[PDB]
Amino acid sequence: NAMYLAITNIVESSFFTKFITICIVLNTLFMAMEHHPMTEEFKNVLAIGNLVFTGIFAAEIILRIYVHRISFFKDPWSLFDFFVVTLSLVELFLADVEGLSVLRSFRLLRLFRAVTAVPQMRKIVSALISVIPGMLSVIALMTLFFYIFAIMATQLFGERFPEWFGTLGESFYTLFQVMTLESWSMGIVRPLMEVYPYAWVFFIPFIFVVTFVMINLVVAIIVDAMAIL
């Protein structure tokens, strides 16, 4: 276990770990060299740079598993790192990854684990981690509201125009559009008033109930800071 613990100490060395994060932020700046005026000859060195960056990450994870069998695997953060670099390797395995490879850009969020050092950000991150479950519950209830309302809508207005309400997928997307108060009037509801003169009585109570629910979300976001302090 001699070189095991020795090189394992070099793994847990902050020089190495912070070097990995410098490689991470340098990889993100390497993706910030995704211009369109890049040249095709300089594109090949960009490709081999992505190659060697992903190789460095794969080397990092094969060392982290050469130490840990299941101990890192209990930790979901390590599972997140392993999962995203293996998805980068499936990008390196003939798959139609669109851009999911630079989901490893999300590895930059480990710098988030250093940005908490501002004394307000401690309260902010404890607050966000505290309000995750209640927000998941209000996402559930608001999606239920969307579910019944979009079913009503796609039965109602399916015929004269199915571009907005033909399926349930596109009717559901359309009610997310009318949720965020953008062109429901000029883009959506005024074409309905051109045909159906009694759909404003559908849409206006929908605006009230989901403005209600979203403001309720804001309230259950508010409560944490008076809960802590």
């Binding site: 490709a47 003939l94 139609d96």
Partner: protein
């Protein structure tokens, strides 16, 4: 046919067409669709 993981150019792609492979312009290698 031309195997798996083989370098190429999209301009003169010569992958194993039978297995739905095409040399991508960004990757410069035959991807499995």
């Amino acid at each position: 046919c031309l195997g798996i993981f083989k370098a190429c150019n999209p301009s003169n792609d010569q992958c194993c067409k039978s297995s739905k492979l095409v040399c991508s312009r960004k990757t410069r290698w035959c991807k499995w669709q």
